[PDB]
Ligand binder design. Structure first.
Ligand SMILES: Nc1ncnc2c1ncn2[C@@H]1O[C@H](COP(=O)(O)OP(=O)(O)OP(=O)(O)O)[C@@H](O)[C@H]1O
Ligand SMILES: CC(C)C[C@H](N)C(=O)O
Length: 1004
């Protein structure tokens, strides 16, 4: 119960020792003469502050909290500073979903957790102060300070002075941003243009990834829209617009097929709309493909849909229709009753010759009279149109769609599963092997012409360009974004000579697996015009079209170097509004001033702060750059971290040594094995967990969740496993510091001492190796569970009394491995072993030699003792045990050349049909040829569990003498009286023969 309160007692105290001696602070002036093993510099991506931080936030940053704790014991100075993000609509569109809930339901509010109000009362905030949040400033007055007090109680190795806030509410960071961006105009890494990006009407701006709430990586996405003439007789429901040419509008992907046009598809219970183009004509689409067109510069008044009739395609079927590109001089509009309303325009091109949905849906209106019934389609309109050979794909003939639907045997337009895989092998095959048929292109492949076919339909005014969200994208403000076409300021992320440079920063960077380098190795290939011009959201304003703000991801890319000087400029304020310790007014640092600080070969400027101050920050910068590490989620890999490199390349143009050195992708966080969603009661915040289980326990779990890229698993049930094994360790250390009088003195020479010493030293090592590969799962595995594994064997296996000055060894070396997992615990220990310094001043306990014969031996006892505790529970008092000198007959010529198939094989023997093979053929083993492979079978499975020796005809340690050494751990925890040790050529005959060395047996 009070398992855990006790930890948080010492915890918070150490926290307030750690700060009133500023352990984790370091300054570059000081820490440059004393280069012990150099600078380590890691980073967390700073997190947006629409909230305190949650567990899956810490797991992400944990990766370094351990890292720094480990290196600074290996001999490196550590800088891991934390900054907080707010340059985003996350804070904005959160605060505003709030104020609208007040505007519409009053305050205190009244609704017909899950609402914006009912999330910040779900944090315990007074009714009077929740309303203080509507203006987004009171988020920044409020949330940044709360995060830093949160990590206080994690114990996070931070030089806190290097914090900040990120928006223009801060004057220091702000000029920094500016400098970046003056340079990127100056280096042609921004340009003004009009380009297709993904856009929120309700935001009134672009919204690339980190402004969204759906589809974090969805692209400016292309379509070919065909302009079909509605024809006289106009259908009875089209009266009014006598005044214009009225167009049906329908969005294809393969324009190269539109000769195969037979009719038009609309689902008749869908709601269409027809507007005025700026052309002056009338279109007709979904309500949404309309409002897309609009923001694409279709409607005379961009963004606004000049709707003139609402209606449902039930009123529309059967109206005559000239189509571009097809011999069917008149096609009609027909019903395909499944038309999803996400994609397209609710009006779907019909190529029955060459897509199965068309030929299927069209089969029916020909198959079933009583379908032209519910929709009154005369017989001219359906029957006589039969498909058109426009592509011939070899395998399937001219009309690849009808050909393969008579052989997938599709009955309806509703056989959907089989209509889908009909489509599969045929849409893409048609797209290379395709060769056009009808003239202009006689026999030219599809891949060639698809471009120039759509070419001629535009030029002739029969079609123009539609673009749409690939998949639906809702915004941070709950808006269905749509693909617009707009003035923006865009980063040239695709200009070749920039791309090819940074891929030499991708290759030169170190990732941690090759599913990481894979991801970027993608994103690099696709990145081009990425807008940074937001006119809405918190931020910093662009300094030459000032009306523009900066999008969250693009003011966020070289900021790390701010972490290098924020402690001298912002003095460890958060808004950096207070006065600097280095007296530089926020005004007083200008594009020349930065430039000196940040480009080595930059000239002193005529600044208004003299030389002695500004030489300082070039010293700090050039000392910690470049950035050794970034541990993020796996989710900023393709967007932020891939701009991390463009920016770093393009701003230091040749300081290759300043570029990023490493970055480690890990996955998202599972609390107790489920999506951590505040929806379903499965979610935890740092201020929530740290008070649930001691941070040193919550810390401990974290290291023990995942260290792949694959999603990690925080398991409460194991979170509490720690708070136990941790306390049961402390009250063991209290036990020895209570009982020096009973730990054996003098020489540390007992067989198990020698076992345990070279065990422990073989531990330390594995834990060094696991730590450096940053596999904190394993660093913990080897460092605690396996370190207790020996202390806990050594206590039993040595009934001779554990040695004193090899206990204090263990308590020390084990404390010292745990430092980065539990700096609080371990420091509580360190003072109580009487060291008068602090445990972040510690050094890696270098390991003594390993006596690996002395391990490979002790596995022999800790093994078979767990063996004959099985033969026992059948039924004695008086016991016997049998061994062997060399291998018995049959299994010295089994084993003598079982070798045969590895010294002249280098990797393995042949599978187990040719096992009985030519040993059965032995003049010897015909007798036991039924047990030879059973004994052969299981002695392979400890050749990847014991190493490669298991086929030496000799061991490395005297099989007996090493047992006569521990016989009394045996005659004690086995509670039999005497136990003889014979060599079994004295034994009974049934074990005289088929027991060998390593395989002992016993009488009773
Ligand atoms: N379990 C998690 N889920 C999401 N992000 C996580 C998780 N654990 C750690 N993170 C990290 O938390 C950080 C929060 O800061 P930032 O504001 O830059 O990202 P984020 O916007 O919170 O991410 P997202 O919208 O994808 O959840 C991110 O860098 C991400 O690396
Ligand atoms: C629904 C499809 C058969 C229409 C057109 N061939 C396209 O792929 O968009």
């Amino acid at each position: 119960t009070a398992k855990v309160d006790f930890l948080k007692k010492i915890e918070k105290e150490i926290q307030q020792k750690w700060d009133t001696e500023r352990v984790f602070e370091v300054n570059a002036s000081n820490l440059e003469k004393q280069t012990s093993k150099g600078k380590y510099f890691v980073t967390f991506p700073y997190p947006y502050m629409n909230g305190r931080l949650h567990l899956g936030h810490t797991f992400s940053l944990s990766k370094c909290e351990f890292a720094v704790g480990y290196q600074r014991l290996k001999g490196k100075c550590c800088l891991f500073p934390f900054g907080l993000h707010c340059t985003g609509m996350p804070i904005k569109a959160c605060a505003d979903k709030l104020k609208r809930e007040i505007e519409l339901y009053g305050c205190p509010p009244d609704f017909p957790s899950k609402y914006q109000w009912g999330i910040m009362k779900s944090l315990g905030l007074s009714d009077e102060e929740i309303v203080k949040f509507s203006e987004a400033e009171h988020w920044l007055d409020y949330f940044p300070p709360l995060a830093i007090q949160d990590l206080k109680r994690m114990g996070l190795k931070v030089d806190w002075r290097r914090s900040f806030i990120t928006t223009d509410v801060n004057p220091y960071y702000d000029s920094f941003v500016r400098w970046q961006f003056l340079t990127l105009r100056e280096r042609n890494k921004i340009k003004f243009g009009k380009r297709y990006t993904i856009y929120s009407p309700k935001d009134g701006q672009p919204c690339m990834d980190h402004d969204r709430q759906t589809g974090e990586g969805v692209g400016p996405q292309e379509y070919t829209l065909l302009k079909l003439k509605v024809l006289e007789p106009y259908p009875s429901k089209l009266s009014g617009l006598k005044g214009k040419n009225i167009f049906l509008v329908a969005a294809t992907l393969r324009p190269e097929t539109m000769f195969g046009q037979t009719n038009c598809w609309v689902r008749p219970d869908m709601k269409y709309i027809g507007f005025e183009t700026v052309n002056g004509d009338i279109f007709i689409c979904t309500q949404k493909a309309a409002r897309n067109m609009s923001y694409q510069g279709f409607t005379k008044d961009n963004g606004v849909v000049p709707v003139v009739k609402e209606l449902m395609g039930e009123e529309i079927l059967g109206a005559s229709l000239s189509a571009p590109l097809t011999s069917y001089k008149v096609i009609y509009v027909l019903p395909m009753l499944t038309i999803k309303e996400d994609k397209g325009t609710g009006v779907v091109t019909s190529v029955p010759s060459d897509s199965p949905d068309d030929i299927a849906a069209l089969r029916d209106l020909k198959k079933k009279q009583a379908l032209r019934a519910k929709y009154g389609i005369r017989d001219d309109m359906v029957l006589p149109f039969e498909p058109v050979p426009v592509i011939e794909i070899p395998g399937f003939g001219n009309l690849s769609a009808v050909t393969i639907c008579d052989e997938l045997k599709i009955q309806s337009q509703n056989d959907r599963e089989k209509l889908a895989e009909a489509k599969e092998k045929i849409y893409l095959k048609g797209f290379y092997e395709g060769i056009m048929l009808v003239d202009g292109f006689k026999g030219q492949k599809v891949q060639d012409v698809k471009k120039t076919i759509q070419k001629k339909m535009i030029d002739a005014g029969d079609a123009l360009i539609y673009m749409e969200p690939e998949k639906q994208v809702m915004s941070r403000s709950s808006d269905e974004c749509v693909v617009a076409l707009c003035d923006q300021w865009y980063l040239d992320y695709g200009e070749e000579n920039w791309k090819k440079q940074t891929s030499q920063c991708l290759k030169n960077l170190e990732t941690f697996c090759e599913e990481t380098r894979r991801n970027f190795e993608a994103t690099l290939g696709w990145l081009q015009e990425h807008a940074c011009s937001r006119t809405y959201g918190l931020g910093t304003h662009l300094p030459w079209d000032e009306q523009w703000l900066i999008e969250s991801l693009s003011d966020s890319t070289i900021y790390m170097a701010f972490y290098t000087v924020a402690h001298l400029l912002q003095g460890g304020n958060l808004h950096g509004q207070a006065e600097s310790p280095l007296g530089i007014r926020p005004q007083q640092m200008t594009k020349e001033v930065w430039d000196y600080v940040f480009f080595k070969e930059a000239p002193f400027p005529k600044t208004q702060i003299a030389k002695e101050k500004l030489d300082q920050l070039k010293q700090e910068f050039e000392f910690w750059y470049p950035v050794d590490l970034r541990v993020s989620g796996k989710d900023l890999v393709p967007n932020h971290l891939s701009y991390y490199l463009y920016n770093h390349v393009a701003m230091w143009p040749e300081q290759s040594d300043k570029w990023p050195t490493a970055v480690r992708a890990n996955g998202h966080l599972l609390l107790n094995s489920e999506k951590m969603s505040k929806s379903t009661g499965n979610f935890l915040t740092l201020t929530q967990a740290i008070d649930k289980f001691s941070a040193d326990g919550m810390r401990l779990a974290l290291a023990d969740a995942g260290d792949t890229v694959e999603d990690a698993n925080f398991v409460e049930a194991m979170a509490d496993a720690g708070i136990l094994r941790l306390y049961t360790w402390v009250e063991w250390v209290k036990e020895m510091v209570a009982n020096w009088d009973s730990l054996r003195s003098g020489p540390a020479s007992t067989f198990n001492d020698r076992v345990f010493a070279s065990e422990l030293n073989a531990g330390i090592i594995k834990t060094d190796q696991n730590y450096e590969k940053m596999m904190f799962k394993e660093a913990l595995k080897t460092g605690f569970f396996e370190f207790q594994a020996a202390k806990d064997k050594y206590r039993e296996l040595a009934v001779e009394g554990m040695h004193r000055e090899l206990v204090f060894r263990f308590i020390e070396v084990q404390t010292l491995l745990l430092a980065p997992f539990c700096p609080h615990l371990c420091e509580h220990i360190w003072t109580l072993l009487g060291k008068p310094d602090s445990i972040m001043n510690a050094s890696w306990p270098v390991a003594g030699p390993v006596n690996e014969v002395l391990i490979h031996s002790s596995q022999y006892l800790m093994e078979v003792t767990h063996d004959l505790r099985l033969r026992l529970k059948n039924y004695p008092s008086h016991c016997t045990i049998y061994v062997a000198k060399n291998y018995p007959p049959w299994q010295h010529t089994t084993l003598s050349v079982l070798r045969k198939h590895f010294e002249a094989n280098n990797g393995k023997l042949p599978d187990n049909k040719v096992i009985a093979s030519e040993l059965g053929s032995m003049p010897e083993l015909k007798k036991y040829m039924k047990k030879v492979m059973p004994f052969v079978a299981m002695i392979k499975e400890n050749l990847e569990k014991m190493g490669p020796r298991i086929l030496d005809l000799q061991l490395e340690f005297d099989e007996k003498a090493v047992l006569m050494e521990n016989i009394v751990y045996l005659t004690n925890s086995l509670e039999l009286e005497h136990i003889e040790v014979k060599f079994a050529s004295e034994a009974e005959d049934k074990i005289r023969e088929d027991c060998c060395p390593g395989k002992p047996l016993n009488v009773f």
